[PDB]
Each structure stands twice: as structure tokens, then as C-alpha cells.
């Protein structure tokens, strides 16, 4: 890992189970904050 | 002011078991945990133990050891010619409230 990010001061953070010849799908919508 | 008391120097042939004794008192070692640090010449000291027995990942298994009472001890085997270094015993103090450190013992491979 660590190839993407370089440095950061974090505000929100969240962790959970993994999201997932197979077909994933997602809808990302950002409304009202 | 109690002070940790390591041996000034140690020498042993390769293969044998090497004992490094850090001696103190009840306030320092008799009540809390002691950790041990490894320093090569011209290097920043690094972790070699903690919790008096346990080892950080990579910590030489050959170097391990726990002791009770007012003293702590480190045991070493398979002394490679690279294992020549200085070993520090680190300790906290419950009464004076300042971290104490060992004098430092240097290991020689004959």
C-alpha cells in the first residue's frame, strides 16, 4: 500500500467489512453534506 | 537517586550463552517493566525486547531472557561477528518519576 497517499491530517474515519466472473456495482451520491 | 547497574563490558566465544545483568532496586526494577536496546556503532539504538520477555518482530531469538527480583538479565546465543554492540536496559521509576537508563555493556566476538 501507501502508493496513493503522501501526507494528511484526518477528520473522519470509518472501517468495516469488505465491500465485496463477477459484476460489482455502486452508486455514489453526495447530497446535503 | 538509584541508578541501573549493567556490567561495564562482556566478552564471550561464539555459541555460548552470554548474561548481561542490569541491577537496580525496588523502585526501578522491583516494581515495573524493563526493556532492552541494541546499538551498533554510528547507529540510532533500536528495540530488542519489552515486557521483560517479549520481542519486537525481527528481535534475535538467540538474545532473550527474563529475571526477577531487583535485577534483570539478557541471555544471548549464536553470537555472530555482527552481534557486537552496546545493550541498554531501560526502566521507569515510580518514586522519583524519571525514566532511568543503563550504563551500557559492549559485546565482543572473540
Amino acid at each position: 500500500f501507501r502508493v496513493y497517499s503522501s501526507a494528511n491530517n484526518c477528520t473522519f474515519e470509518y472501517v468495516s467489512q469488505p465491500f465485496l466472473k463477477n459484476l460489482r456495482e455502486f452508486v455514489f451520491k453526495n447530497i446535503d453534506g | 537517586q538509584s541508578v541501573l547497574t549493567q556490567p561495564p563490558s562482556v566478552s564471550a566465544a561464539p555459541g555460548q550463552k552470554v548474561a548481561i545483568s542490569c541491577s537496580g532496586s525496588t523502585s526501578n526494577i522491583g516494581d515495573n517493566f524493563v526493556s532492552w536496546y541494541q546499538q551498533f556503532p554510528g547507529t540510532a539504538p533500536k528495540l530488542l525486547l519489552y515486557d521483560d520477555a517479549r520481542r519486537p518482530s525481527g528481535i534475535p531469538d538467540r538474545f532473550s531472557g527474563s529475571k526477577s527480583g531487583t535485577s534483570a538479565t539478557l541471555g544471548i546465543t549464536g553470537l555472530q561477528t555482527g552481534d557486537e554492540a552496546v545493550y541498554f536496559c531501560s526502566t521507569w521509576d515510580n518514586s522519583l518519576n524519571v525514566v532511568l537508563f543503563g550504563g551500557g555493556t559492549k559485546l565482543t566476538v572473540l
Partner: protein, 123 residues
């Protein structure tokens, strides 16, 4: 991934003050209670100062009480040690050590150590 950068290292005269300003990288700063440990050449380690996650100092060594002031900023990810009124014995190399805990004094183990900087005090 944990690099601890130093600064403020250079010959300083017998009476002038100095500011060693360690840094940090690759880990959460305000969670971990940092330290400052010196080593005189040809000698073992000598604890100099500590600090916690709330920047509430732990206490200074007996020889340097009232002349060293340790502080930190968790925003600028730094840890400063403003030496005041140096002397001959204060020459050493100063590692910006680290502690795994945030309370520093239940018998802690200092994991990551910076490469340190050399402060020499001579005329």
C-alpha cells in the same frame, strides 16, 4: 515508514540558548507521547525530557531542570526543546525518541528513534 527528522544542531557558544526541533512522518502524531534522549560521545544514554499527547510535560532530568523547555504542536507535527543557558557538559547527540503509549511512565518501551543531531558547546 516512521522517519523522525531533527534540526537545530550546530556549534553553540557556552552561554547561548538553542532550539532543537524534531519532526515526524507516516504515523499519527497526537496519539503518541514523544521524548528527547541525549547521548554524550563515548557514553550511554541520558534521558532529557518527555511529553504526552496533551503536551503535558513529564519532567526533566535532574541536571537539566529549569533550563530545558519541551513543547510540541500536533498540527505542525513537531516536538521542540528550547535549551536555555547551555554549558560544557550539554554537548551530545539528541535522538528524538518515541513511546508506544500516550501516558509515558507505566514502564514504557521507546520504539522508533531518529538519527539524531549533534550539539557541541565549545569556544
Amino acid at each position: 515508514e516512521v522517519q523522525l527528522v531533527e534540526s537545530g544542531g550546530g556549534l553553540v557558544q557556552p552561554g547561548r540558548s538553542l532550539t532543537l526541533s524534531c519532526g515526524a512522518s507516516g504515523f499519527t502524531f497526537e496519539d503518541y507521547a514523544m521524548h528527547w534522549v541525549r547521548q554524550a560521545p563515548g557514553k550511554g544514554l541520558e534521558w532529557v525530557s518527555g511529553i504526552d499527547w496533551n503536551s503535558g510535560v513529564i519532567g526533566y532530568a535532574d541536571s537539566v531542570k529549569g533550563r530545558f523547555i519541551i513543547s510540541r504542536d500536533n498540527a505542525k507535527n513537531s516536538l521542540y526543546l528550547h535549551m536555555r543557558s547551555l554549558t560544557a557538559e550539554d554537548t551530545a547527540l539528541y535522538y528524538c525518541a518515541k513511546d508506544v503509549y500516550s501516558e509515558s511512565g507505566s514502564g514504557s518501551y521507546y520504539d522508533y528513534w531518529g538519527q539524531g543531531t549533534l550539539v557541541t558547546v565549545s569556544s
